[PDB]
Amino acid sequence: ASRFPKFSRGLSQDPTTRRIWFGIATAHDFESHDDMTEERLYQKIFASHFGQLAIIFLWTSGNLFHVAWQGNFEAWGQDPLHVRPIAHAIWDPHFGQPAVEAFTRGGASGPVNIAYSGVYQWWYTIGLRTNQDLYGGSIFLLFVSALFLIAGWLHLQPKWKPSVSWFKNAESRLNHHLSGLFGVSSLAWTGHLVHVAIPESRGEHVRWNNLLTALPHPQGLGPFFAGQWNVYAQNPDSNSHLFGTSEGAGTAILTFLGGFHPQTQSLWLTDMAHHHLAIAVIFIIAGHMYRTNFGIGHSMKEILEAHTPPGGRLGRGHKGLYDTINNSLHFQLGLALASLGVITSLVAQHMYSLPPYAFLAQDFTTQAALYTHHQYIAGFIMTGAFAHGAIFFIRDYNPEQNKDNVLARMLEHKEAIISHLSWASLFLGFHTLGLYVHNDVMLAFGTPEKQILIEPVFAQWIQSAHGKALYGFDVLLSSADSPAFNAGQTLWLPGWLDAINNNSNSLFLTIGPGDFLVHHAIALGLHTTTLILVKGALDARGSKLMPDKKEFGYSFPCDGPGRGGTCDISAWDAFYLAVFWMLNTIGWVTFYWHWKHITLWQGNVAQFNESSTYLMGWLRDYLWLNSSQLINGYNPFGMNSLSVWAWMFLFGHLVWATGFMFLISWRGYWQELIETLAWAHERTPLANLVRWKDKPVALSIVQARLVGLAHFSVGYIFTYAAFLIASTSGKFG
Amino acid sequence: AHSVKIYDTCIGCTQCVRACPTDVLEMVPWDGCKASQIASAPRTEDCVGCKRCESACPTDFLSVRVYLGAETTRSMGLAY
Amino acid sequence: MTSISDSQIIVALVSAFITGILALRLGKSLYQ
Amino acid sequence: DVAGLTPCKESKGFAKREKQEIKKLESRLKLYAPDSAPALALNATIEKTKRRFAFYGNEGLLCGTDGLPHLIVDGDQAHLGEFVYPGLVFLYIAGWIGWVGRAYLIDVRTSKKPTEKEIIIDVPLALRIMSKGLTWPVAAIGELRSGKLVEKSANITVS
Amino acid sequence: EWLPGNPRPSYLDGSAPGDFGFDPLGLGEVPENLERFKESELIHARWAMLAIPGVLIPEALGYGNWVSAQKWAATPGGQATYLGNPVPWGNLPIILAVEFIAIAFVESQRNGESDPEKRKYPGGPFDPLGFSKGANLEELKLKEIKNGRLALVAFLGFVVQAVAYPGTGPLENLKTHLADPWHNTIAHVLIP
Amino acid sequence: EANTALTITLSTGALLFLGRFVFLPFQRDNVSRQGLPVQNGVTHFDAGDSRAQEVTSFLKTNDPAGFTIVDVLAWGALGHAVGFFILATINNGYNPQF
Amino acid sequence: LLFLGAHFVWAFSLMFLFSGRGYWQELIESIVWAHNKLKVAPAIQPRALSIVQGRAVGVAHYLLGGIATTWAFFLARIISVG
Numbered sequence A: 001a002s003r004f005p006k007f008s009r010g011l012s013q014d015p016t017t018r019r020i021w022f023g024i025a026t027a028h029d030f031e032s033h034d035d036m037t038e039e040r041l042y043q044k045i046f047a048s049h050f051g052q053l054a055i056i057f058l059w060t061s062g063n064l065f066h067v068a069w070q071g072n073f074e075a076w077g078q079d080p081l082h083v084r085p086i087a088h089a090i091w092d093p094h095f096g097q098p099a100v101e102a103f104t105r106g107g108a109s110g111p112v113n114i115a116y117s118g119v120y121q122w123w124y125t126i127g128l129r130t131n132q133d134l135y136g137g138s139i140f141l142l143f144v145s146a147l148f149l150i151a152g153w154l155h156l157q158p159k160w161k162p163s164v165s166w167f168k169n170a171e172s173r174l175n176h177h178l179s180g181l182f183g184v185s186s187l188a189w190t191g192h193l194v195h196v197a198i199p200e201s202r203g204e205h206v207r208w209n210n211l212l213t214a215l216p217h218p219q220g221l222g223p224f225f226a227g228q229w230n231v232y233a234q235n236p237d238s239n240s241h242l243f244g245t246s247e248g249a250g251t252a253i254l255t256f257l258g259g260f261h262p263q264t265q266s267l268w269l270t271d272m273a274h275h276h277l278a279i280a281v282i283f284i285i286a287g288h289m290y291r292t293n294f295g296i297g298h299s300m301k302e303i304l305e306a307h308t309p310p311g312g313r314l315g316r317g318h319k320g321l322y323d324t325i326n327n328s329l330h331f332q333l334g335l336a337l338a339s340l341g342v343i344t345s346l347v348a349q350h351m352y353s354l355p356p357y358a359f360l361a362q363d364f365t366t367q368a369a370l371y372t373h374h375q376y377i378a379g380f381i382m383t384g385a386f387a388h389g390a391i392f393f394i395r396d397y398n399p400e401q402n403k404d405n406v407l408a409r410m411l412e413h414k415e416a417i418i419s420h421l422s423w424a425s426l427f428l429g430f431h432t433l434g435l436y437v438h439n440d441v442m443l444a445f446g447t448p449e450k451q452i453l454i455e456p457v458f459a460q461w462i463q464s465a466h467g468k469a470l471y472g473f474d475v476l477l478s479s480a481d482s483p484a485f486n487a488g489q490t491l492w493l494p495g496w497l498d499a500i501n502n503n504s505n506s507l508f509l510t511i512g513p514g515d516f517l518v519h520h521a522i523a524l525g526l527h528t529t530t531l532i533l534v535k536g537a538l539d540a541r542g543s544k545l546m547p548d549k550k551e552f553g554y555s556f557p558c559d560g561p562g563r564g565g566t567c568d569i570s571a572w573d574a575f576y577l578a579v580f581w582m583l584n585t586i587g588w589v590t591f592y593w594h595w596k597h598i599t600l601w602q603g604n605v606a607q608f609n610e611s612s613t614y615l616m617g618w619l620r621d622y623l624w625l626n627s628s629q630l631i632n633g634y635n636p637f638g639m640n641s642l643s644v645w646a647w648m649f650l651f652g653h654l655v656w657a658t659g660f661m662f663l664i665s666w667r668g669y670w671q672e673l674i675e676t677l678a679w680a681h682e683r684t685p686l687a688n689l690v691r692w693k694d695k696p697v698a699l700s701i702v703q704a705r706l707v708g709l710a711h712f713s714v715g716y717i718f719t720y721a722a723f724l725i726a727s728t729s730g731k732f733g
Numbered sequence B: 001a002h003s004v005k006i007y008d009t010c011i012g013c014t015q016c017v018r019a020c021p022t023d024v025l026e027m028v029p030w031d032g033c034k035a036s037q038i039a040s041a042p043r044t045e046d047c048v049g050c051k052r053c054e055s056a057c058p059t060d061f062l063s064v065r066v067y068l069g070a071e072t073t074r075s076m077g078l079a080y
Numbered sequence C: 001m002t003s004i005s006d007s008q009i010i011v012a013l014v015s016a017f018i019t020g021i022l023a024l025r026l027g028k029s030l031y032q
Numbered sequence D: 001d002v003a004g005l006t007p008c009k010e011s012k013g014f015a016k017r018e019k020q021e022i023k024k025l026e027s028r029l030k031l032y033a034p035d036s037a038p039a040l041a042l043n044a045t046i047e048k049t050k051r052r053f054a055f056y057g058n059e060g061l062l063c064g065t066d067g068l069p070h071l072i073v074d075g076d077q078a079h080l081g082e083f084v085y086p087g088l089v090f091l092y093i094a095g096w097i098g099w100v101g102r103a104y105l106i107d108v109r110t111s112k113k114p115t116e117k118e119i120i121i122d123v124p125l126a127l128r129i130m131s132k133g134l135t136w137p138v139a140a141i142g143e144l145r146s147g148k149l150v151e152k153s154a155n156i157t158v159s
Numbered sequence E: 001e002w003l004p005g006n007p008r009p010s011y012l013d014g015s016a017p018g019d020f021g022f023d024p025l026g027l028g029e030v031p032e033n034l035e036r037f038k039e040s041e042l043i044h045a046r047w048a049m050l051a052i053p054g055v056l057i058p059e060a061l062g063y064g065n066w067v068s069a070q071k072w073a074a075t076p077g078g079q080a081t082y083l084g085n086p087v088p089w090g091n092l093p094i095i096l097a098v099e100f101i102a103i104a105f106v107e108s109q110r111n112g113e114s115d116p117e118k119r120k121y122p123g124g125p126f127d128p129l130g131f132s133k134g135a136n137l138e139e140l141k142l143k144e145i146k147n148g149r150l151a152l153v154a155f156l157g158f159v160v161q162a163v164a165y166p167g168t169g170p171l172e173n174l175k176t177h178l179a180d181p182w183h184n185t186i187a188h189v190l191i192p
Numbered sequence F: 001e002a003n004t005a006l007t008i009t010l011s012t013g014a015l016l017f018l019g020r021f022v023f024l025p026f027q028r029d030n031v032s033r034q035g036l037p038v039q040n041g042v043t044h045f046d047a048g049d050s051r052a053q054e055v056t057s058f059l060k061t062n063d064p065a066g067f068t069i070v071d072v073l074a075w076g077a078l079g080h081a082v083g084f085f086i087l088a089t090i091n092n093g094y095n096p097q098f
Numbered sequence G: 001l002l003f004l005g006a007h008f009v010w011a012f013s014l015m016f017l018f019s020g021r022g023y024w025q026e027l028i029e030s031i032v033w034a035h036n037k038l039k040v041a042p043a044i045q046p047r048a049l050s051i052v053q054g055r056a057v058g059v060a061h062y063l064l065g066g067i068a069t070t071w072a073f074f075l076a077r078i079i080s081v082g
């Protein structure tokens, strides 16, 4: 309390440098602070969430301002396919003149950075056209962040502090959040689309000054209240429409065309409008479900209690889970993180194949960057979901209240779960690695016709069920006699079939034996990471080796060398181990995506179709082949604009290597070395005049694991980001 | 400032006391075992956390347990 | 065709300073 | 045919690959004496390549665009030899080895010192158990139905 | 009794109508489940018994196939032709709304019953002739449940034979069996 | 072409009739069984949520059946929704031959 | 082939180098339950490798992988261009 860790006495009284490290590392864990009550915990969390919102909005405002100030948004808008967007300017005093010449891209007057976030396409699609629009948005977002800061400060005041019962009103919070935050927000977005952005793509200009007089439709709101909702879809945009101009432009606002806009190769705007309108209606209806102050609606506890199978196969069913979830913040955090990870993976998978932004899918580097970014985010989020679930088992789980319900019966057959997961992982690993090595041996001996190439007929059958007429399966949407084809042949199927039978886009790419092998390696990675995380979560409360782990908390180094040795015994260590597998799996996924799309964009898909069936093919035709321009960023003959990416590549290799030092070498060596260093310092003339305040010590065991994992992950991310950006920007194809 | 607890499954073999490198443990007269003695931990302020006592305890599960806690210049084993 | 005026930059900087003051107040409230 | 795959005999690219391999082998052969051992070895390799290509073409394998055989494992009656038959043979062999190992473990469990027989194998008993593994599926189903295959009172940790 | 000599389950003593101890899957082990299953069997069977005469009679009299009887819907127009005469109120939306409202009211009225015996056998206004007063309830219930189970099996046969032979009705398939029995049977579907 | 006023009137009347006469006992006893959102065996308002006090002035009834204004709103919303669904389906112009 | 195999073995050593014994002991406990369920548990009780053995296995497989990678690289290059 006296010293820096004001929230911890044990850390405050520590005389070593461990105090600073652990005060930093445990600052944002409010349940562990001294004299912490539930009410203070909830209010502090609520204010911190306000602060996070303010930070997010300031980040967006900064992007907008820097693009409006130093970017060529208007020049890019004039010629989207021939101008490189500008992220921010460069002012580095350490440059030399050749670098200043090399980084002057775009139409800029000085060195700049080319943007790969895709915000140009997103802002252009939603109606923003000039720099004044971006400036207005930046100022507005500054105001919004200020509003959230004021809100946090106010709702922390004694008069305005909410009570603990307010934070536990699940039905009312879910009712408002589901109705407003989802349905009304999507309804407002549909309003923006219809009222502003659709006219922009047809050569109109609608702003705040003429919003009240510019009709979205020639006969506005007449048919809507007359029941003639089909009037708004009469005249869609033509296939010869030019985005941003009135050439071949329709007047419909809610079409249901399906497919892609031919000029921009993205989804129609009116499709997106009807989509967000339907989503808004569904969410607003779904909000009016749970009971509140008006005496109608369902009650979530009664729903959980009623659902319980007779015959006792599930035990007591979902009984008692309401209080377990309401009183545990870690259970809620785990559920939210799992859902968010699934949703992020969905975003990544569904954005590369159905691009929503005009001019995207022609900026190859942006597409690759977006995919990799959100996929790595999803992986980290999933690992966090499992970690905070393990924290729930250790901290908030009460065995007596969850007597014989589903939650306890999960702990009941945990050995069966872990055993069958181990079997699945072993099976996938053995037979997949065996097939890869067998193919390697076959091609090494000069006989590539002896390799085991298995056709992925299930995924091909699914593709044919979608209407792809390449594999000759002739089922469902591929069959003209099917009821589904006849039912959909007028609403959405023309455009959808035209898009899915095109072999130039990324909508249901053609697949072969290599794709089969890679999806199987991905399945191996998923089941193995799940094995590690589930083993950590279920064995968190105790095992045969240490039956009282729940008394030692979530994170602790070990239990000593007794009983054979107990290194890496806590559930935190299972998190630590599973992070490596998560990184490896996401690496496999991104490697596969990037190589397939490189071959697609160069037009040479045969190289992937032939070289992906063996591992030497990967190592030779992906990495070594595509690292040429990257490693030639700077050489004894000068430097290119890829110099920064080459430097980042080497930087990532170096940081990743440095992480190994913390990962492999442990503490006692370093502690003794520091002891010798302290002796040396105390005995040196002109240096004894200076004394340390904190006694130097080596890092803790858990701290060493964390620092090694951090250096490792940073090196991983920076290396792959540099390689991806350079290998896709050197060619742009 | 580690905490050392003794549980009533102790048999008084005195191995933990002999194994302690900082004289934290000692034997105390008791009733409840054939040896009629039990271990005690009065000098827990001098415990370093080596867990030799736990390694020396013969029992299905340990009768002596060490719970690591706040670190001090004595717990850290610093000679400087 | 627009290029952002200098007075616009002045306004943005002043607004950012005010937002920073508000953030300082919120952080002080959280710490205490 | 299936997934737009052509038969190997009908396909072009299979024959092209055969021609390329034979041409490479003959180019290597051009350096040696006609009656020397390297010439005989290279000729043997050439004949083996010809026989392999003929067998693959005549066995009824589908061929991809790149000219290499592909496998079908969805259960098709025309391609059972690709997956289903070797799978059944492997299942028989693996069940045999696993079943005889389990039987030997069970028989050794009731001994004066099971660990000694665990490291030093009782060869006569092992041979008897190994020979009795021909009809392992029948014995396995027998013990599954008789209730002598699974256990109910096993050691577990604190739930 | 469904299988001679087989032991009978404990809960299925043999007192309920049509109780032959047939329960290989053990679905009636839970008592409340057993009562619900008894009522649901009665309802499904009564519906099938009332249905299949309407499956047979139109085909016998023509202008009907119980699958082409639904053909006028899912077709623009045709909202007519009950018995060869157009229906003045044959439109699909009004038919659907009337059926939904009427059946919902009737069924909700049924659902408001406390006594399980009255749940299965209401009596009173549903027995105008008082057949339930002649001290023959057990035999009548056995006959009802037997004819009902036969009707359920018959309707399942109708559905499956419609799946196997699209565009045909039951009597047409019977005439096909009678036309050449040894080369027109379920073997042509089970064994292609 | 479908009459908007007639369709909405008929649909809302049907839903209101269903709610008032047909499904009213089922709604009543099911909402009686699922009484109130309850945390740790006590309701939110009694647990101390001042904003969660039930409004009874807005729940007063004078119908013999106890039919409430919120019930009116719910069944009328369903009626308007079904009427607009029927109107849009009739005016869709999409007539697939099945 | 040995170039690829040596990169593989060097990677394989990292799982012994980066991990600890308690995790593997608990996983072995679960697997031993699985084998016990079918009356096929071994008489000699399976145990995770000791701490010193884990370190030794890691360093041995690491050195083998790295040295074999360099071996294959040097021999291929110098036989080709020498």
Ligand code: CLA
Pocket (backbone or CB within 6 Å): A045, A046, A049, A050, A053, A166, A167, A169, A172, A173, A174, A176, A177, A179, A180, A181, A182, A185
């Ligand atoms: C209608 C009223 C209403 C509204 C609008 C909100 C809104 C909010 N509440 Mg809330 N709340 C309400 C009533 C309401 N509440 C009531 C009645 C109670 C008491 C019972 C509470 C109690 C409460 C608590 C206790 C907390 C909140 C919090 C929050 C915030 C959540 C963080 C956030 O912004 O998520 C934004 C989420 C979305 C916009 C949903 C988007 C859907 C998915 C995720 C993405 C889909 C969009 C699309 C695909 C992507 C497009 C993006 C673009 C780049 C293309 C959010 C602003 C939390 C907070 O942060 O505090 C400040 C918090 O801790 N509320």
Ligand code: CLA
Pocket (backbone or CB within 6 Å): A654, A657, A658, A660, A661, A662, A664, A665
């Ligand atoms: C390849 C990665 C890598 C790197 C860079 C290091 C670095 C180091 N290790 Mg090491 N180590 C590694 C992997 C690595 N390790 C692995 C994998 C293991 C496991 C076997 C070990 C095991 C190990 C042991 C057992 C020992 C070391 C030691 C050392 C130190 C050597 C002496 C020294 O000060 O060097 C000086 C040179 C450097 C630190 C690098 C050059 C400086 C760079 C260029 C940056 C300097 C300027 C910088 C920009 C400052 C500005 C910062 C500002 C911008 C914030 C040094 C800190 C020894 C030690 O403690 O030293 C006495 C020692 O005993 N390591």
Ligand SMILES: CC1=C(/C=C/C(C)=C/C=C/C(C)=C/C=C/C=C(C)/C=C/C=C(C)/C=C/C2=C(C)CCCC2(C)C)C(C)(C)CCC1
Pocket (backbone or CB within 6 Å): A330, A331, A333, A334, A335, A338, A342, A385, A386, A388, A389, A390, A392, A393, A537
């Ligand atoms: C440990 C723990 C935890 C955690 C957990 C987790 C983390 C989990 C996860 C999980 C997950 C992560 C899951 C996922 C899932 C998913 C799914 C399950 C899906 C499904 C889907 C479907 C089913 C679909 C379908 C379809 C199709 C296919 C097509 C179209 C149509 C449709 C839609 C129908 C917690 C916190 C609880 C707490 C306690 C402890």
Ligand SMILES: CC1=C(/C=C/C(C)=C/C=C/C(C)=C/C=C/C=C(C)/C=C/C=C(C)/C=C/C2=C(C)CCCC2(C)C)C(C)(C)CCC1
Pocket (backbone or CB within 6 Å): A281, F012, F016, F072, F073, F074, F075, F076, F077, F078, F080, F081, F082, F084
């Ligand atoms: C008194 C009385 C009486 C009378 C009564 C009456 C007359 C009633 C009425 C009632 C009513 C008359 C009601 C109503 C209601 C309504 C509502 C409540 C509505 C709502 C709506 C909505 C919510 C909508 C929505 C939407 C939109 C906005 C857009 C489109 C889509 C939708 C549709 C979703 C009598 C004679 C019997 C006698 C006794 C007493």
Ligand SMILES: CC1=C(C/C=C(\C)CCC[C@H](C)CCC[C@H](C)CCCC(C)C)C(=O)c2ccccc2C1=O
Pocket (backbone or CB within 6 Å): G015, G016, G017, G019, G020, G021, G024, G025, G047, G048, G049, G050, G051, G053, G054, G055
């Ligand atoms: C993987 C791993 C294990 C698990 C590995 C184990 C248990 C070693 C297994 C060795 C082999 C596979 C055992 C083979 C057993 C018999 C010889 C099999 C005979 C039958 C035929 C296969 C011949 C540890 O125990 C460990 C301990 C400390 C630090 C790191 C680790 C570590 O990383």
